[PDB]
Amino acid sequence: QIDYRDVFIEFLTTFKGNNNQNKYIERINELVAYRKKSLIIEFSDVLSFNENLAYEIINNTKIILPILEGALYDHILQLDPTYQRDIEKVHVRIVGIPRVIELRKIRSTDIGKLITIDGILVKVTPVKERIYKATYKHIHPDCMQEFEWPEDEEMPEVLEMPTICPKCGKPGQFRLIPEKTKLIDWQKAVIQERPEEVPSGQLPRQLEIILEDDLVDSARPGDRVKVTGILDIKQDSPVKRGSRAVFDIYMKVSSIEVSQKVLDEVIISEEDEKKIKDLAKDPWIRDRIISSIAPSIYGHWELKEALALALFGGVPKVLEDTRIRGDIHILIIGDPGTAKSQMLQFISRVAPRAVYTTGKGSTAAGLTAAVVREKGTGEYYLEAGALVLADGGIAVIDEIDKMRDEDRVAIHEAMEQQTVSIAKAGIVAKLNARAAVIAAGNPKFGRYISERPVSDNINLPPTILSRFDLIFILKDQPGEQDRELANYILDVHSGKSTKNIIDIDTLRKYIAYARKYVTPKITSEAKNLITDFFVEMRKKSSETPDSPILITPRQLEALIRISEAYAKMALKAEVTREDAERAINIMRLFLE
Numbered sequence: 001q002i003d004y005r006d007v008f009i010e011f012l013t014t015f016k017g018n019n020n021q022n023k024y025i026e027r028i029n030e031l032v033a034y035r036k037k038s039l040i041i042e043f044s045d046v047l048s049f050n051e052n053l054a055y056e057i058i059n060n061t062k063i064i065l066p067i068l069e070g071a072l073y074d075h076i077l078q079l080d081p082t083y084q085r086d087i088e089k090v091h092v093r094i095v096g097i098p099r100v101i102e103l104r105k106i107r108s109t110d111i112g113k114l115i116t117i118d119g120i121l122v123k124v125t126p127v128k129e130r131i132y133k134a135t136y137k138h139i140h141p142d143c144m145q146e147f148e149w150p151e152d153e154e155m156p157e158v159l160e161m162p163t164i165c166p167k168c169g170k171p172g173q174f175r176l177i178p179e180k181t182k183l184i185d186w187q188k189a190v191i192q193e194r195p196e197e198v199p200s201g202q203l204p205r206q207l208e209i210i211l212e213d214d215l216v217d218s219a220r221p222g223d224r225v226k227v228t229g230i231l232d233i234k235q236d237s238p239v240k241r242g243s244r245a246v247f248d249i250y251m252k253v254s255s256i257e258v259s260q261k262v263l264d265e266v267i268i269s270e271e272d273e274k275k276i277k278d279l280a281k282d283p284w285i286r287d288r289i290i291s292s293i294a295p296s297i298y299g300h301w302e303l304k305e306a307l308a309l310a311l312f313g314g315v316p317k318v319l320e321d322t323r324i325r326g327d328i329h330i331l332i333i334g335d336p337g338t339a340k341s342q343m344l345q346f347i348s349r350v351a352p353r354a355v356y357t358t359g360k361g362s363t364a365a366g367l368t369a370a371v372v373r374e375k376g377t378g379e380y381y382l383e384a385g386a387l388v389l390a391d392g393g394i395a396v397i398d399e400i401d402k403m404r405d406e407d408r409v410a411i412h413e414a415m416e417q418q419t420v421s422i423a424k425a426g427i428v429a430k431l432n433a434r435a436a437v438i439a440a441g442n443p444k445f446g447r448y449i450s451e452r453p454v455s456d457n458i459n460l461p462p463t464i465l466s467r468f469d470l471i472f473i474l475k476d477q478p479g480e481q482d483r484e485l486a487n488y489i490l491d492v493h494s495g496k497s498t499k500n501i502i503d504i505d506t507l508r509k510y511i512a513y514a515r516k517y518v519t520p521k522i523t524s525e526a527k528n529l530i531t532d533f534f535v536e537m538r539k540k541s542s543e544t545p546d547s548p549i550l551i552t553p554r555q556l557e558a559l560i561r562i563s564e565a566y567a568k569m570a571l572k573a574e575v576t577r578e579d580a581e582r583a584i585n586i587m588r589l590f591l592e
């Protein structure tokens with residue numbers, strides 16, 4: 001009925017904008033120049049112009065949007081009439097609308113309404129095509145004319161056919177002519193609820209969504225994504241279950257946005273004061289190290305550090321051959337607990353963006369892969385449900401021992417440049433897993449790692465170990481002797497250490513991890529103290545013609561100079577002096 005073409009063309013062209021310089025005509029220009037069909041308009045720019053526009057769009061989106069889209073194309077042809085032949089209908093898409101509904105709680109009254117959803121994107125199918133509008137011609141003495149099949153609506157997955165056609169008004173033979181038929185690009189993805197949002201009970205919810213036209217290959221699995229879509233249902237036909245609607249859900253995606261750095265940040269607000277009161281000059285390093293330990297002390301002086309360190313940052317990114325392998329990967333192989341990671345892993349479950357995968361791997365990937373069948377008829381999905389879900393976070397993997405035979409060739413990649421190269425002919429993609437890996441594994445027979453070399457003990461890997469930075473063993477504890485206070489620590493007393501606040505449990509996370517606003521490039525005397533260590537360690541080995549394997553600093557000089565520099569990323573802004581001493585120590589301890 002009522003018509004907003006007026007407001008539309010009187011908006012895009014007349015809108016002032018950030019610089020108070022005409023925008024949305026300029027976006028239009030780039031669009032017509034680059035042969036792209038999408039118009040991304042901010043909702044806050046509309047609400048700062050016309051409010052009623054919002055309500056009508058967002059609630060009547062179903063019918064209103066395509067109207068506005070065609071109405072735009074008209075204005076676009078008369079800026080550049082040669083825009084024909086290349087595009088049929090440009091798209092109008094809205095970013096950052098007010099209604100953002102968690103995929104967990106979804107009203108059944110929200111079908112056909114415009115909404116936004118936060119979540120992580122896990123499974124994605126390959127690019128496919130479909131018929132947008134099919135053009136048929138009727139063979140008989142009463143027709144000999146052409147027509148489009150989905151009148152006033154759109155056609156479905158499986159295409160329908162005669163008998164009756166409007167032209168002549170009879171049944172008969174119908175030939176499809178691809179000459180006039182319009183086609184559309186197609187893809188399907190699965191948004192899983194965020195590991196944070198997930199209550200301890202039940203399981204993360206999932207939503208099936210459909211990426212159309214140029215939205216294809218916009219989002220890659222493992223991404224932290226916000227989408228804006230219009231929900232729908234198809235079914236046709238539901239089989240098997242049961243649970244629970246019974247409505248196949250359909251999200252037709254208008255827009256996707258991958259924009260963020262760490263948006264999982266639980267809060268800053270008041271807590272900025274508290275973590276800054278926590279950056280106090282006191283030996284904050286040692287106490288913070290005492291915090292992750294609790295409540296257990298065994299032979300941990302090295303490990304307490306290595307974990308504290310692993311939880312922290314240090315990621316230089318250079319456009320020429322990106323080299324990071326930061327976010328230090330540590331592996332503790334020990335006999336059956338023995339307290340193992342059954343405790344320390346649980347403490348490394350208190351952390352941001354933390355993926356705990358118990359055993360080899362869950363979800364039929366465990367690191368990454370492409371899958372068969374599974375909804376269905378032979379639909380091919382590409383899904384990686386483990387190590388690339390920890391992107392910008394820690395993947396705590398217990399029992400590496402059981403790792404899939406096929407996967408040990410994938411980690412060579414995902415632990416090196418932190419990408420996964422995948423070509424199964426379903427697609428060729430580089431998945432982004434920047435995750436730190438804190439690992440654990442059983443040895444071959446009980447506790448074997450005293451006499452036998454620490455290699456060959458962990459079974460599967462011969463090399464992957466080289467792709468770890470700090471690997472520790474769990475001492476059998478023959479010589480403990482210290483265990484009076486050390487054990488009674490918490491079995492009665494609340495108090496343990498001089499600080500005794502121990503940064504709580506959450507709070508230690510609200511700073512130590514949740515705070516990487518720090519980017520400490522080390523300089524000056526540090527640069528030297530590490531070097532004199534480099535030459536002395538090297539020459540110490542290379543002086544002996546016996547070839548003692550070189551002590552292997554050559555690649556490691558890289559990741560020591562990650563460790564230290566970014567070990568004392570612990571609320572130290574760019575400042576690095578004696579931090580070196582700590583790292584060079586534990587590495588000289590390690591190399592030998």
Ligand SMILES: [Zn+2]
Pocket residue numbers: 138142143164165166167168169170171
């Ligand atoms: Zn006919």
